[PDB]
PDB file of C-alpha atoms in Angstrom:
ATOM      1  CA  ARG A 570      79.692 211.345  12.510  1.00  0.00           C
ATOM      2  CA  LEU A 571      76.942 209.207  14.058  1.00  0.00           C
ATOM      3  CA  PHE A 572      77.992 209.068  17.738  1.00  0.00           C
ATOM      4  CA  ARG A 573      79.268 211.626  20.232  1.00  0.00           C
ATOM      5  CA  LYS A 574      79.853 212.046  23.952  1.00  0.00           C
ATOM      6  CA  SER A 575      77.241 214.824  24.143  1.00  0.00           C
ATOM      7  CA  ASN A 576      75.553 217.463  21.997  1.00  0.00           C
ATOM      8  CA  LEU A 577      77.519 219.976  19.924  1.00  0.00           C
ATOM      9  CA  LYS A 578      77.398 223.726  20.471  1.00  0.00           C
ATOM     10  CA  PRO A 579      76.506 225.914  17.462  1.00  0.00           C
ATOM     11  CA  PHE A 580      79.356 226.891  15.116  1.00  0.00           C
ATOM     12  CA  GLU A 581      81.612 224.168  16.548  1.00  0.00           C
ATOM     13  CA  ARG A 582      83.424 221.504  14.522  1.00  0.00           C
ATOM     14  CA  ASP A 583      85.399 218.470  15.685  1.00  0.00           C
ATOM     15  CA  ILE A 584      88.311 216.755  13.955  1.00  0.00           C
ATOM     16  CA  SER A 585      89.283 213.990  16.424  1.00  0.00           C
ATOM     17  CA  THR A 586      88.458 210.476  15.178  1.00  0.00           C
ATOM     18  CA  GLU A 587      88.438 207.907  17.997  1.00  0.00           C
ATOM     19  CA  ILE A 588      86.059 205.054  18.817  1.00  0.00           C
ATOM     20  CA  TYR A 589      82.989 206.524  20.541  1.00  0.00           C
ATOM     21  CA  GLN A 590      82.375 204.687  23.807  1.00  0.00           C
ATOM     22  CA  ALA A 591      78.720 203.980  24.580  1.00  0.00           C
ATOM     23  CA  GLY A 592      78.507 200.889  26.785  1.00  0.00           C
ATOM     24  CA  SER A 593      81.865 200.770  28.617  1.00  0.00           C
ATOM     25  CA  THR A 594      84.494 198.012  28.125  1.00  0.00           C
ATOM     26  CA  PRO A 595      86.978 200.077  26.061  1.00  0.00           C
ATOM     27  CA  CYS A 596      87.724 198.394  22.752  1.00  0.00           C
ATOM     28  CA  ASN A 597      91.490 199.325  22.725  1.00  0.00           C
ATOM     29  CA  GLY A 598      90.792 201.708  19.851  1.00  0.00           C
ATOM     30  CA  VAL A 599      89.165 199.393  17.337  1.00  0.00           C
ATOM     31  CA  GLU A 600      85.521 198.696  16.520  1.00  0.00           C
ATOM     32  CA  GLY A 601      83.859 197.124  19.546  1.00  0.00           C
ATOM     33  CA  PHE A 602      80.681 195.433  20.757  1.00  0.00           C
ATOM     34  CA  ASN A 603      79.861 198.309  23.107  1.00  0.00           C
ATOM     35  CA  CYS A 604      82.003 201.190  21.941  1.00  0.00           C
ATOM     36  CA  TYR A 605      81.560 202.154  18.302  1.00  0.00           C
ATOM     37  CA  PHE A 606      83.456 204.309  15.810  1.00  0.00           C
ATOM     38  CA  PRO A 607      81.387 207.392  14.928  1.00  0.00           C
ATOM     39  CA  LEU A 608      83.137 208.050  11.599  1.00  0.00           C
ATOM     40  CA  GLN A 609      81.558 206.024   8.783  1.00  0.00           C
ATOM     41  CA  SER A 610      81.115 206.479   5.039  1.00  0.00           C
ATOM     42  CA  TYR A 611      78.185 207.157   2.720  1.00  0.00           C
ATOM     43  CA  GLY A 612      77.096 204.851  -0.078  1.00  0.00           C
ATOM     44  CA  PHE A 613      76.080 206.662  -3.256  1.00  0.00           C
ATOM     45  CA  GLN A 614      74.460 205.180  -6.354  1.00  0.00           C
ATOM     46  CA  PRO A 615      73.713 206.659  -9.789  1.00  0.00           C
ATOM     47  CA  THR A 616      70.250 205.029  -9.870  1.00  0.00           C
ATOM     48  CA  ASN A 617      69.182 205.597  -6.251  1.00  0.00           C
ATOM     49  CA  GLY A 618      66.218 207.625  -5.023  1.00  0.00           C
TER      50      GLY A 618
ATOM     51  CA  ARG B 294      82.290 208.737  36.909  1.00  0.00           C
ATOM     52  CA  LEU B 295      82.094 212.400  37.924  1.00  0.00           C
ATOM     53  CA  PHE B 296      78.789 213.472  36.320  1.00  0.00           C
ATOM     54  CA  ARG B 297      75.270 212.055  36.256  1.00  0.00           C
ATOM     55  CA  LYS B 298      71.730 213.177  35.495  1.00  0.00           C
ATOM     56  CA  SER B 299      70.617 212.626  39.105  1.00  0.00           C
ATOM     57  CA  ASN B 300      71.462 210.604  42.204  1.00  0.00           C
ATOM     58  CA  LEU B 301      71.854 206.820  42.128  1.00  0.00           C
ATOM     59  CA  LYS B 302      69.636 204.431  44.065  1.00  0.00           C
ATOM     60  CA  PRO B 303      71.349 201.905  46.374  1.00  0.00           C
ATOM     61  CA  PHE B 304      72.564 198.649  44.794  1.00  0.00           C
ATOM     62  CA  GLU B 305      72.313 200.131  41.289  1.00  0.00           C
ATOM     63  CA  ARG B 306      75.126 200.127  38.726  1.00  0.00           C
ATOM     64  CA  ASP B 307      75.334 201.896  35.372  1.00  0.00           C
ATOM     65  CA  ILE B 308      77.274 200.787  32.295  1.00  0.00           C
ATOM     66  CA  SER B 309      76.236 203.579  29.903  1.00  0.00           C
ATOM     67  CA  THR B 310      79.017 205.947  28.848  1.00  0.00           C
ATOM     68  CA  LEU B 311      83.787 208.883  32.491  1.00  0.00           C
ATOM     69  CA  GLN B 312      87.359 210.002  33.191  1.00  0.00           C
ATOM     70  CA  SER B 313      90.621 208.108  33.555  1.00  0.00           C
ATOM     71  CA  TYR B 314      92.587 207.892  36.799  1.00  0.00           C
ATOM     72  CA  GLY B 315      96.299 208.391  37.465  1.00  0.00           C
ATOM     73  CA  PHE B 316      98.466 206.350  39.832  1.00  0.00           C
ATOM     74  CA  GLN B 317     101.958 207.088  41.142  1.00  0.00           C
ATOM     75  CA  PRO B 318     104.386 204.885  43.091  1.00  0.00           C
ATOM     76  CA  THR B 319     105.807 207.744  45.193  1.00  0.00           C
ATOM     77  CA  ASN B 320     102.502 209.530  45.842  1.00  0.00           C
ATOM     78  CA  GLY B 321     100.924 210.111  49.242  1.00  0.00           C
TER      79      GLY B 321
END
């Protein structure tokens, strides 16, 4: 997760995966110019740092 | 909007993000 509505309390986890709205204009649940999905993936390499 | 850090100056709008609103046809 990279975006959230607010901060997270200690020992609290969240499962819901919806597009995180940041600059209004709801994106009808897809990636948007203002609102952005907080759930992304890592890229791992065998020869990275 | 129902929550904010402080009061809003006149003729100032904010786009940063908020709760949805419900309408009924047979309401008051």
